[PDB]
Amino acid sequence: SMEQVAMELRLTELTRLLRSVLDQLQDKDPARIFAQPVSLKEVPDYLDHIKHPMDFATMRKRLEAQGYKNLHEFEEDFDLIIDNCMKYNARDTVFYRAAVRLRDQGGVVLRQARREVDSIGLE
Structure with missing residues (x-):
């Protein structure tokens, strides 16, 4: 139906905006601490915790689908x-501190993304 196509165009548009958001958020992780899933070979007990x-690569896979x-x-x-990250790692670690900085810097990006999604009507 034409309605289905229109909905699909909206989703494609949302995906384009979210790709831009994702790129901006990942730029706030220059150390690439959150780029990939925590390895269960290096941290075998991770799933107990x-x-x-979640990680940026996994988000990107879902996004492009x-x-x-x-x-x-x-x-x-x-x-x-x-x-x-803020649960597994203690406050005095480079990991926890990277997450705090990503959260703080990311808030700015997500604040305006919400306005854009609403204004253009992408959802």
Whole structure:
């Protein structure tokens, strides 16, 4: 149907915006601490601690499959990256501190992304 096509165009448009958001968020992680999934070879007990692992590569895979239907879903996954890190790692670690900085700098980006999604009407 034409309605289905129109919905699909909206999703494609949302995916384009979220790709730009994802790139901007990842730029705030210059150390690439959050670029890849935590390796279960290097951290064999990780899943005992963290029940829903997340990272930027995994987000990008979901994104390019158009698997984010709205901004909330995307934000959920970004928050997992930060929140998982801040639980597994202690305050005095480079990992925890990187997550704090990513959260703080990312907030700016996500604030305007919400306005753009609303204004253009992408969800």
